[PDB]
Design a binder for this molecule. Structure first.
Ligand SMILES: NC[C@@H](O)c1ccc(O)cc1
Ligand code: VO4
Length: 425
């Protein structure tokens, strides 16, 4: 299995749909390595829950929480963490308004080596219970021989790219992690790192982050041959008065680069209502009416969540993925799993006559390119060489009575899976 792409365990589906799936407890298990230290990058944290996910033998090893919380939220997290002597915090600078530290990553230092986990879940119980989430698991990276001269770099430049991603935080606790990474051999890595960090980026720096980073990698490492672009996310930013301000102009331009139909997959109200969680799934799909009403044009692109292939049509998506399938959806030019939702905040927007890329947030994903395996395309695994696309293809268009889930309006005409309504207030 060259991909090491996994879905999270979902409670309440037939065990067969969990056979290849991982829970955070599986990831932190002693079978994965003898744990020495770890760093947990994320957005939302439940500290008490998090510590319980570690096996008892490792619960006392040092843990760094890398978050972007400010003011009261920051003190609240510090409070959550106070009781546990072994936990430190690193607040990621967020100098631009409306930015978040949204990246989900685990750095796991073991006696036997190092593991990097890049994924889509918050460190709270409900993100790992009944949601469709994605995980990339790196191989066990060995420590570089105490007396040898090697970069420990991969053909994909993962080691250096990860270091540059961490370097951008300018944070003392991350420098130690940077030092740990320097000391390991990451050469077996076959994926590309695509990061976002807060900044306004000029000249050659534009290629470093966000959608320009992706455009850059697709230009250098993909080959060109009508192939659609598929985008799949759980949050939607304000994209502009029409499709030509950002979505189809700079954003799609990056995505269609190689060496045109746009499908956007986003849960409808019906998807959420009939889900395993019901309407409360909607708490993690924060599309607000203020944003939606500004951009009714967008919803023509929306397609339903459907994941029969993985038994997860009722497990609402918190994963985010982008890909480039062939016209019959049987193969793909590339696949990306990332924390980046469909927002300018996450991906970048061009400013100052198009000489500046403005990103608001930290995001991180892994791009799977066939060339990194010495292929030209991946065949799509039709039943979750062959890439495990986690939802059904082709995607299904919203019906005429369908609506995009909007989290801050009420739904009171029809009860959900648990006989409940939704009245946010
Ligand atoms: N459910 C908490 C809410 O703040 C939220 C919603 C969506 C996310 O991706 C992360 C957090
Ligand atoms: O954690 V947020 O999409």
């Amino acid at each position: 299995n060259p991909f090491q792409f996994y879905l999270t365990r979902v409670s309440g589906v037939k065990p067969k749909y969990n056979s290849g799936a991982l829970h955070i407890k599986d990831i932190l298990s002693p079978l994965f390595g003898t744990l020495v230290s770890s760093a947990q990058f994320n957005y939302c944290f439940d500290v008490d829950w998090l510590v319980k996910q570690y096996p008892p033998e490792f619960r006392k090893k040092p843990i760094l929480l890398v978050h972007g919380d400010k003011r009261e939220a920051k003190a609240h997290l510090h409070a959550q963490a106070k009781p546990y002597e072994n936990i430190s915090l690193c607040q990621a600078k967020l100098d631009i308004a409306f930015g978040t530290h949204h990246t989900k990553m685990m750095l796991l230092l073991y006696e036997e080596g190092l593991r990097v986990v890049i994924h889509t879940s918050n460190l709270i119980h409900a993100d790992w219970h009944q949601k469709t989430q994605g995980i990339w698991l790196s191989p066990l990276y060995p420590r570089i021989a105490d007396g040898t001269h090697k970069s420990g770099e991969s053909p994909t430049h993962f080691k250096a790219n990860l270091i540059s991603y961490l370097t951008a935080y300018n944070a003392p606790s991350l420098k130690e992690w940077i030092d740990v990474i320097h000391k390991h051999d990451l050469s077996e890595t076959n994926v590309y790192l695509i990061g976002s960090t807060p900044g306004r980026f000029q000249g050659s720096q534009k290629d470093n982050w966000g959608h320009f980073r992706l455009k850059k990698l697709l230009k250098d490492h993909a080959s060109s041959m009508s192939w659609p672009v598929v985008g799949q996310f759980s949050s939607v930013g304000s994209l502009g008065a029409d499709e030509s301000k950002w979505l189809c102009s700079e954003f799609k331009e990056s995505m269609l680069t190689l060496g045109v139909p746009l499908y956007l997959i986003y849960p409808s109200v019906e998807n959420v209502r009939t889900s395993l969680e019901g309407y409360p799934a909607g708490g993690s799909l924060p599309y607000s009416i203020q944003t939606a009403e500004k951009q009714n044009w967008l919803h023509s692109y929306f397609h339903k969540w459907s994941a029969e292939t993985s038994g997860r049509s009722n497990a609402m998506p918190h994963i985010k993925t982008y890909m480039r399938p062939s016209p019959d959806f049987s193969k793909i030019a590339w696949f990306l799993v990332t924390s980046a939702n469909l927002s300018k905040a996450a991906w970048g927007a061009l400013e100052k006559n198009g000489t500046q890329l403005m990103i608001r947030s930290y995001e991180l994903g892994v791009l799977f390119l066939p060339s990194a395996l010495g292929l030209d395309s991946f065949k799509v695994k039709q039943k979750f060489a062959t890439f495990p696309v986690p939802y059904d293809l082709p995607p299904e268009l919203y019906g005429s009575k369908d609506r995009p889930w909007i989290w801050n309006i009420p739904y009171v005409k029809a009860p959900d899976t648990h006989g409940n309504m939704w009245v946010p207030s």
